Design a protein around this ligand. Sequence first.
Ligand SMILES: [Cl-]
Ligand SMILES: [Cl-]
Ligand SMILES: [Cl-]
Length: 292
Amino acid sequence: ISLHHRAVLGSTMAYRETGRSDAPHVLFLHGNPTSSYLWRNIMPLVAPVGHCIAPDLIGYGQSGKPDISYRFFDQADYLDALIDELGIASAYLVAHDWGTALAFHLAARRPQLVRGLAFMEFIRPMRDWSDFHQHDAARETFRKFRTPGVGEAMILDNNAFVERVLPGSILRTLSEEEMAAYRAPFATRESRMPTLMLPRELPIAGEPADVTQALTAAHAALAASTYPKLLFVGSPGALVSPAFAAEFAKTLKHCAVIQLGAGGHYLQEDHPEAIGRSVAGWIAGIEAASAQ
Ligand SMILES: [Cl-]
Ligand SMILES: [Cl-]
Ligand SMILES: [Cl-]
């Protein structure tokens, strides 16, 4: 899998690219602990209608592994730098997990950029631990990730995000090749640090406060925004249940909900054709209706 690379902020970032270069930009944003690989069966279905770019976040996939904190704001800075390097000033965003937090934060700061947002399994500030996920076992696992020393043993030493959380929220069983690809960036203990930092960034009960502020503001900007929105949901889902998707959608302008059926968090692995076909049709409709 040969990706494109660019130098960004003294390190490097990798990205997949496909589609016609005169079509609108479509930026695909993955989360923890995946990469642009998550979109491999989706992007080819959007290529006829969009110039598709799928970055590997810093510390993920084939991107660089600099000595940084890997906090949310680090991810935002490196993504901004790549967007500017690639000349992306107007784009559709297609986002998952921390990719949605990045998309919401980007749209709040650059309100002219977003032509439309397709999203699923998104992050929002959670008032209490009871607002995170659908079952107690997941809540307890993430409580442990956020516990000093314990989280390091689970994620740095045992690679639990890659080896347990990821396959645990895909309905089908990945092939040996697919799981080998997902674990390949994370062969060393130190390389796993980004995957430990992100669960510690989740905004739960106001902590961390800086992420809580950024995503509270970003969600308010999202509620006020007028660009088209497409929210995919699975059953039972993980961060987003079908019931919560329908209720969240009512708080937004111009947001349709697409039901994918049985799925957990990594809906791209269980429903790639449905997501790709939906996004491509949606872009085609927006482009035609906005071109008059
Ligand atoms: Cl542009
Ligand atoms: Cl909150
Ligand atoms: Cl389909």
